[PDB]
Design a protein around this ligand. Structure first.
Ligand SMILES: *[C@@H]1O[C@H](CO)[C@@H](O[C@@H]2O[C@H](CO)[C@@H](O[C@@H]3O[C@H](CO[C@H]4O[C@H](CO[C@H]5O[C@H](CO)[C@@H](O)[C@H](O)[C@@H]5O)[C@@H](O)[C@H](O)[C@@H]4O)[C@@H](O)[C@H](O[C@H]4O[C@H](CO)[C@@H](O)[C@H](O)[C@@H]4O)[C@@H]3O)[C@H](O)[C@H]2NC(C)=O)[C@H](O)[C@H]1NC(C)=O
Ligand SMILES: *[C@@H]1O[C@H](CO)[C@@H](O[C@@H]2O[C@H](CO)[C@@H](O[C@@H]3O[C@H](CO[C@H]4O[C@H](CO)[C@@H](O)[C@H](O)[C@@H]4O)[C@@H](O)[C@H](O[C@H]4O[C@H](CO)[C@@H](O)[C@H](O)[C@@H]4O)[C@@H]3O)[C@H](O)[C@H]2NC(C)=O)[C@H](O)[C@H]1NC(C)=O
Ligand code: HEM
Ligand code: HEM
Ligand SMILES: CCCCCCCCCCCCCCCC(=O)O
Ligand SMILES: CCCCCCCCCCCCCCCC(=O)O
Ligand SMILES: *[C@@H]1O[C@H](CO)[C@@H](O)[C@H](O)[C@H]1NC(C)=O
Ligand SMILES: *[C@@H]1O[C@H](CO)[C@@H](O)[C@H](O)[C@H]1NC(C)=O
Ligand SMILES: [Mg+2]
Ligand SMILES: [Mg+2]
Lengths: 234, 234
C-alpha cells in the first residue's frame, strides 16, 4: 500500500494510454490525472516501470502539444486524434467510427486471442495483431490514417507492453498474457498475479530492435499519401 | 535601464528567431540563452512585447521538441530544420545551401528594399517579400520544402514583426522600417529610435486576420508533396 491501485472515479482524467492510466491508478502520477508535466512522467515511468528518460522525454513533449497549458496536460487531452493518438489501436476504436479514448473489449479480442496455445504474447504475435488491427481499420474505416509514423508509433506501443509487462527479462520481447490482459483491461500493475517492475532499464536502445522486428514481421504497407503530419495543438 | 541591451558573448546561445534573441539580449530571457522553458517564454514575451500566452504556448511547446531536455531548450536548438525552422526565411539562408542560424544581410536585402517610397513595412509589402523569398529558394535550393505549414509559419512570423515592432497600434499591420531593421540586424529593441512596447495585447485573434491577409496577397502555391510532417526531436 505504497502506490496501491484504486479504480479511477468521475474526478479522474484518463486517456488512451494504458501506460500512463496505470501509473495514475497507482499514484505514481496524480490520481486525478491532472496537471501532469514531462518531468512528472519521467519520474513516474522510472518508478513504476523502470522506463528511462530518453523515451519518456521524446514522447512526453509530443504529448504536451495536446493541451492548452504551458507545460502540463490532463491525461484525457492525449486522445487528440493525429498528434499521437492513431487508428488501429490495440484496445480502442478508430475516432472516425467510435470511441478512441476508452478500453474496448470488442477491439481487444484480437490481442486476447493472439499467440494461440502459448501463455505469452511475443514479437511474432504482436506483429500479427498489428497486421490484423490495421486490416480491420482498412476494411471498416473510410477515413483511416496509416503512415510510416503511425506504424512506428504502433510498434513502439507493442514494444512497450511487451517489455514493461515482462516476467524478468525485457530483452526477450515477450510478456505473460495474464499480466498484459490485466494491464489493458484494468489499467493495473498485476502484482497479485506475479508481476514485478523490471530490474533492467527500458531504454531507446533496448526497445529499438524489438520495434523494428515487430514492424518487419507485420507485413506492413502505407495507405494514401503516407504523410507523417501531426496535429500540433488543440 | 532594468533591461538594457547587451551583445551576446561567444558562449551565449542564440537561435534563428529575432524575437527570442532580442528578449535574451535585454535580459527578459536569460542572457545566456540556456535553460529556457515555455513559462519563461510566456513571461518574457509579455514583459518585453505584450505578446500573450496563447501564441507563446502554442509555438513554445513546438520549440521544446528541438532539445533533448524534459522541459527546456537552448535558443540555438531552435535551428533544428523542419520543426519550426524553415526555408525561405526573411533573414537567414536555407540550411541545404547555407547558414540557417545567423542573421544574413544579403538575404535581408529583399525585406530591407521592400515597400519602396514608404517609411513603413506593411501587409502588402510583407506579402511581396514572402513571394520573392520563396521564389529565391525555389530557384536556388533543390531541396526546398514549401508546404501549407511552412507558409503559415512564414506569414505568422511576418505578422509578429509587423505587430511587435509597430509604432504603437499593432492592429494597423504596419511597422516603421527604422524599428524593424534594428530588430533584425541587431536583435535589439529600438528604444533610442523611438519604439515602445505595445499597450495593446498581441493575441491569436489579433494576429490571425493579419496572417491570412499576408498569405492571401503573396500569390502562394505549394511545392512537391505538400506534406506538413515536422521533425519531432533531435
Ligand atoms: C511466439 O510464440 C509462438 C508460440 O509459442 C512461437 O511459435 C512456436 O514455436 C515453437 C518452437 O519454439 C514451435 O514448436 C515446434 O512445433 C513443431 C511443429 O510445428 C508444426 O505443427 C504445429 C502444431 O500443429 C497444430 O495445427 C494447428 C495450427 O494451425 C493447431 O491449431 C493445432 O492445435 C496443432 O497444434 C503448428 O502450429 C506449426 O505451424 C507447424 O505446422 C515441432 O516439430 C517442433 O518439435 C521439435 O522441437 C521440440 C522442441 O522445441 C522438440 O521437443 C521435438 O522433439 C521436435 O524436435 C516444435 O514443437 C511451434 O510450431 C511454433 N508455433 C507457431 C504457431 O508458430 C514463436 O516462435 C514465438 N516467437 C518469438 C519471436 O519468440
Ligand atoms: C503599403 O504601403 C504602400 C506604400 O505606401 C501602399 O501603396 C500605396 O498606396 C497608395 C494608396 O494610398 C497609392 O497612392 C495612390 O497612387 C495612385 C497612383 O499613383 C501613381 O500614378 C499616378 C498616375 O496614374 C501618378 O499621378 C502618381 O504620382 C503615381 O506615380 C494615385 O493615383 C493616388 O492619388 C490619388 O490619391 C491621393 C491621396 O491618396 C491624392 O493625393 C491624389 O491627388 C489622388 O487623388 C494615390 O497617390 C500608392 O500608389 C501606393 N504605392 C504603391 C507602390 O503601390 C499600400 O497600399 C500599403 N498597403 C497596405 C495593406 O496598407
Ligand atoms: C510510461 C510508459 C508507457 C507505456 C507502457 C505505454 C504504453 C502504451 C500502449 C501499450 C499503448 C497502446 C494502446 C492501444 O493500442 O490500445 C499506448 C498508447 C498511447 N500512449 Fe502510451 N505508454 C507509455 C507512455 C506514454 C507517454 C509518455 C505518452 C505521451 C505523453 C503516451 C501517449 C500515448 C497515446 C496518446 C496513446 C494512444 C495511441 C493510440 O492507441 O491511438 N504514452 N501507450
Ligand atoms: C516572442 C515573440 C516572437 C517574435 C516577435 C518572433 C519573431 C520571429 C520572426 C520575425 C522570425 C522570422 C525570421 C526570418 O524569417 O528570418 C522568427 C523566426 C523563428 N522563430 Fe520566432 N518570434 C517569437 C517567438 C517565437 C517562439 C515562442 C518560438 C519557439 C519557441 C519561435 C521560434 C522561431 C523559429 C524556430 C524561427 C525560425 C524560422 C525560420 O525563419 O526558419 N519564435 N521569429
Ligand atoms: C530510429 C528512430 C525512429 C524513427 C522516428 C521516430 C521518432 C518519433 C517517435 C514517437 C514516439 C511516440 C511513441 C511513444 C509510445 C506511446 O505512444 O505510448
Ligand atoms: C498563429 C497562426 C499559426 C497557427 C496555426 C496552427 C498550425 C501551427 C501553427 C504554428 C505557429 C508557429 C509560430 C511560431 C512563432 C515563430 O515561428 O516565430
Ligand atoms: C491544473 O490544470 C488546470 C486545467 O486542467 C489548469 O487550469 C491549471 O493551470 C492547473 N493547476 C495548477 C497550475 O495549479
Ligand atoms: C536533395 O535534392 C535532390 C533532388 O534534386 C535529391 O536527389 C536528394 O536526395 C535531396 N537530398 C535530400 C537530403 O533529400
Ligand atoms: Mg487510437
Ligand atoms: Mg529558416
Amino acid at each position: 500500500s505504497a502506490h496501491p491501485w484504486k479504480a479511477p472515479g468521475p474526478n479522474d482524467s484518463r486517456g488512451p494510454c494504458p501506460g500512463l492510466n496505470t501509473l495514475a491508478n497507482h499514484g505514481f502520477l496524480p490520481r486525478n490525472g491532472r496537471n501532469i508535466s514531462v518531468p512528472m512522467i519521467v519520474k513516474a515511468g522510472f518508478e513504476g516501470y523502470n522506463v528511462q528518460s530518453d523515451i519518456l522525454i521524446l514522447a512526453g513533449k509530443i504529448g504536451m502539444l495536446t493541451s492548452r497549458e504551458a507545460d502540463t496536460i490532463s491525461l484525457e487531452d492525449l486522445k487528440l486524434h493525429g498528434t499521437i493518438e492513431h487508428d488501429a489501436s490495440l484496445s480502442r476504436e478508430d475516432v472516425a467510427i467510435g470511441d478512441n479514448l476508452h478500453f474496448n473489449e470488442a477491439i481487444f479480442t484480437t490481442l486476447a486471442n493472439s499467440n494461440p496455445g502459448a501463455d505469452v504474447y511475443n514479437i511474432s504475435s504482436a506483429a500479427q495483431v498489428q497486421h490484423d488491427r490495421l486490416a480491420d481499420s482498412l476494411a471498416r474505416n473510410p477515413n483511416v490514417t496509416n503512415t510510416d509514423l503511425t506504424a512506428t508509433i504502433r510498434s513502439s506501443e507493442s514494444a512497450f507492453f511487451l517489455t514493461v509487462m515482462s516476467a524478468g527479462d525485457p530483452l526477450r520481447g515477450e510478456a505473460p498474457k495474464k499480466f498484459v490482459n490485466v494491464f489493458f483491461r484494468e489499467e493495473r500493475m498485476p502484482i497479485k498475479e506475479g508481476w514485478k517492475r523490471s530490474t533492467t532499464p527500458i531504454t531507446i536502445p533496448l526497445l529499438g530492435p524489438i520495434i523494428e522486428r515487430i514492424t518487419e514481421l507485420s507485413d506492413w504497407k502505407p495507405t494514401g499519401d503516407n504523410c507523417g503530419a501531426i496535429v500540433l495543438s488543440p
